[PDB]
Amino acid sequence: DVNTLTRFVMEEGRKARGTGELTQLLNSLCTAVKAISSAVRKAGIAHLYGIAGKLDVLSNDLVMNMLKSSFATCVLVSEEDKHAIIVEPEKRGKYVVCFDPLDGSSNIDCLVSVGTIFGIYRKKSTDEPSEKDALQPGRNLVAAGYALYGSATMLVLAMDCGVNCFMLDPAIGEFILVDKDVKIKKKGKIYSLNEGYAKDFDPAVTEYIQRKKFPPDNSAPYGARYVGSMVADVHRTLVYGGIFLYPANKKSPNGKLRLLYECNPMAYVMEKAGGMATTGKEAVLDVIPTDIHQRAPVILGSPDDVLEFLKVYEKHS
Amino acid sequence: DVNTLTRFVMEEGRKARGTGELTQLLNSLCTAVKAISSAVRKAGIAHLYGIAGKKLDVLSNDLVMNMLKSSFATCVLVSEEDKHAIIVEPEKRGKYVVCFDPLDGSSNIDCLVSVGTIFGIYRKKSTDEPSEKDALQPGRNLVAAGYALYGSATMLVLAMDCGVNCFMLDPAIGEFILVDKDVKIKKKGKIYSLNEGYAKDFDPAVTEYIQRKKFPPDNSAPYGARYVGSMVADVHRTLVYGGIFLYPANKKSPNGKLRLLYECNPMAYVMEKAGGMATTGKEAVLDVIPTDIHQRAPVILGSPDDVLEFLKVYEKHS
Amino acid sequence: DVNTLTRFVMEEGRKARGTGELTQLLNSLCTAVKAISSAVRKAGIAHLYGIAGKLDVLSNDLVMNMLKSSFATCVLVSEEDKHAIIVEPEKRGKYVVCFDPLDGSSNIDCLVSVGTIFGIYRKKSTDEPSEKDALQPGRNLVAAGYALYGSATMLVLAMDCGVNCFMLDPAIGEFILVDKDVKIKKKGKIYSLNEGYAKDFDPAVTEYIQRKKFPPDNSAPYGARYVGSMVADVHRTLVYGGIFLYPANKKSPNGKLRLLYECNPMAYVMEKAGGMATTGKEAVLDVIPTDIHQRAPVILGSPDDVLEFLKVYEKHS
Amino acid sequence: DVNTLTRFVMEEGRKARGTGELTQLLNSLCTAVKAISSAVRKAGIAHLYGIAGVKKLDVLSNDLVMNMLKSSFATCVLVSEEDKHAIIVEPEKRGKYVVCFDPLDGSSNIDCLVSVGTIFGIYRKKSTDEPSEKDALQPGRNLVAAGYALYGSATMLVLAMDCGVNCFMLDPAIGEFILVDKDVKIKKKGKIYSLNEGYAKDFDPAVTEYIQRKKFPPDNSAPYGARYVGSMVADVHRTLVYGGIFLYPANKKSPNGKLRLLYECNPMAYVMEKAGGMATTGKEAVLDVIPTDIHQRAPVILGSPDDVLEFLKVYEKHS
Ligand SMILES: O=C(NCCCOCCCNC(=O)NS(=O)(=O)c1cccc(Cl)c1)NS(=O)(=O)c1cccc(Cl)c1
């Protein structure tokens, strides 16, 4: 039977005997994602160019506004906003959402794939909502995932039931379930990181990547791919297997990607698909945050590959 | 004033006193590209999954083939998807030869990587009966070339004698809107792009060149690295931001991997019309004289300062 | 604050402490309407004409399949099907749906407005579901409405809480609430019927139309509009006021429109909007059907206008 | 073989050995029509209702047609239903054609989602004088091309030229007008009549008798059906496809009718005649009226030729 995101979350909710509030959140989020997709594919650009005589800000406003009006959220953390946004009392629900509304957009002038990353927590205390409600370890996530605006638009939704992938049919504005309960390969053949900054690599990263290009045995060297857009690179990692690295170094001892709305959601998707996500010292999902914009190193992907990285990493520690 | 692809080529043709045949070709191609874009973004995918109770690269080929045949502007069509050249039936024969890659990069489309359509347009040069040999022209002979990139948005980049112009597809109205006129690439960039997974097979010149990007001998900042693995995406980034793109020969591909007629030549032509460069290492891509419609070529292309720097390293290794 | 059909029905259901089954039905119905709208506006028609080298049937297939897979329905009556469709046991829910999947399509070759009409009943008996479960008076409706595929696509949904109008935004595939708790004008200035059958009119209709052209109280004559597509004519009646008539004639002594899936849904929308709908002898919603395809005369619209017709009708007994 | 509006006009132009200027006009017009269609179907309406935290359609449509036509380099004088005076195209963008158009005909009732449309008629500038409003004061006989876009259940462009009438369906997935009906001809006699009978008390006696004949046929034939959308493009297009008659006639309160000659009556009369139909004011062919004011009204009775002739017989009978 055909299945849409709307029908899927309703049915997972009836199984869980839920009240429907998380489904309202996700419905509102999907509406925002269709609106972002439409703007990212440049619907209406002819009007900007005078036929009748910003993008990351618009994406942020869409997500912010749909979530606030969902009546399901109370604290909203965005990559685009210095402080957490506190939902006004009359619209407050029980969930905390951290999101990157248009990840990768700094290079959107070249039409690179971009995406929306999100992580959904249940508010844990009864105190007045504040930034501290978003300072939960990724282990506490209720749901997380991303929309990828690539050759097509796809929503990847990870929850306790696993990882499910929904293709946006723009003819009708429906997310169609096309990949159910997806699992990542145990071991891949692609490595993904910015090798231009090799001079700053931690010595363990240098050795691990050397082994991918120059295997000490008779295996074939890994292929290299690096889009420079986290959603594109992580989704390829999910589909094809392999490893994605944005690691710490001496100049950036905490990495550069942001824990709350980049690393944790991707780490959660990965673990629900049978993959791994490490900072090098611990699981990303076990980091207890102290700053809503704090950075974390991340190495994620096929478990055999992540474990091999950790072997080399331990060797230099 | 607002300008569309349709209006633009018609006006360039009136300037040149043309008969309208190349405009008919380009109109037909743009119709195919909009249909390809629609299918690549998965419009109607719900019907495949049973809402009411062809593979993309095949459909893309059919769209380009059929639109070009019915344009009455072409006589020989070479496609990545077809082993032999397609000879247009006599009643629909026009004067142009088109080599194209209908959905470049589609082998990884299952991860939604950017994909694209690449095309190069020649005038048929011989008076012989149309045949595969009509497509064996060096890229220097191109009349027009370019690509559609199906990325975060769909864009058509069209290079001609007048320069390079970029048109954004507005899917609300099915129009390509002129958004970047007479585009020129930066003289020098800060990004290098190649599959470093083949580092073990690199010839010494490539190895040294890449070492210079990571460990600059003048202690300037290292280049950043980007490699989508989809040629249209990487070349378009190279055009927009500058830098250098490399697909050199390796042990799996001793004659390079990218295809001369419908990947390297069209991108080389766009690059040169934008003030960039494109070389095999031994000569300009556009100067290679093809002998086989699917033959491969090594390619190094992008900002002129960067390609020239590579060629100095190449000369150093003779 | 912005509101979608998805969010609206979900929020009405949470207010009512519902189990979500009617929402699943209405969500499935909205998906089908968007796919019908896409096909009616001829998205993809270029493929039929060979770019790469039925409409009422498709609409019926879209509604049947989405409702079956909603797990909310048990009996389905369609204009297109001789007998009621009984949902297979594993997909059975508690609701009965009568619908006209593409009303007006007989004239779609001239691109007349067309529409989808639906009425939703709860199954009342514990017996195995059967065609007889749809033989309920319109008084028993739980929800009803229509999608109009006109200059734009609009879904009008009537329930106990009133009538709400949602515009389909085709850029994002969302029904946006644009008219809340709609009420029809007490009296309009437009009458709508096929005057081509004047030779067959009952004397009461003849006299009423005479009053519209030659007003006895010195008011201006009514304008006449008759699209010939019931959804288009009824929606204008809702928006501008006035009266719509499809009375009996010699070709159709019981009228021409079908009680279960044309007259009843429109009568229910009208009454929920403060309007009226009568056969001449009784309220449409009070007719107790004995055949799922039975016909009924219908006079509906602004209450002052219908009452004036009934005043003339009673004069002729 | 598939044929699009753009491909069709290029090929008609190469046949005529034309310079392409009219094709540029028609291309620009098609771009505006696709943009009108998008706005009419309410693409983006969610932004008006606060999804992220504004011209009326008839204003937007006029702006779209005006701007696309000016930038076509193919026009010199532009007459719009929306503008009191003709627009004179600036010298650097002047071409040889005069365009009269109604950018969103029927829009006054668009709040009920009635079918609406865009109507256009294209003239060659005949004089060597400086371009002025007078260049639009040509009889419909002089039309080079005319037609309409109907935004109904689907969007269709009907284009009438010397070669006949052709119908192109807009495929909104790709923004292409696809040729679906070639060389269209109207039925010789129809079975539908179309006019606002609510104003019957003001009818001219010939109209009263003709409509009486449609409802109470004197020869035991079947009475005609009645249809009246109230949007001219929708009613005229149904008339083209199914046959019959459409009436917006003069009366004593409105001796010149209500519809506008230059950008409503003339283009529809031209489409009808190119399809083998008729269009009359009652006293003469619409296309033969010589206008003196760009916004002047004309009565119009059009459609299947036997039906129109029957009307004219009734009209002549009442002198
Ligand atoms: O999804 C969840 N539950 C499923 C839905 C059940 O609750 C629906 C509440 C609204 N009620 C109705 O609509 N009722 S009605 O009869 O249809 C009705 C009555 C009157 C008017 C109308 Cl129009 C309709 N729970 S969850 O916590 O969000 C959740 C948990 C786990 C995973 C996930 Cl993904 C989500």
Ligand SMILES: O=C(NCCCOCCCNC(=O)NS(=O)(=O)c1cccc(Cl)c1)NS(=O)(=O)c1cccc(Cl)c1
């Ligand atoms: O584009 C080129 N020329 C532009 C104008 C071509 O005009 C030919 C079109 C056919 N003629 C008309 O349509 N005539 S009409 O009066 O409008 C007419 C008459 C009757 C019915 C109608 Cl409906 C319309 N030349 S080129 O070689 O292709 C070329 C060269 C260089 C760069 C490029 Cl990009 C392209």
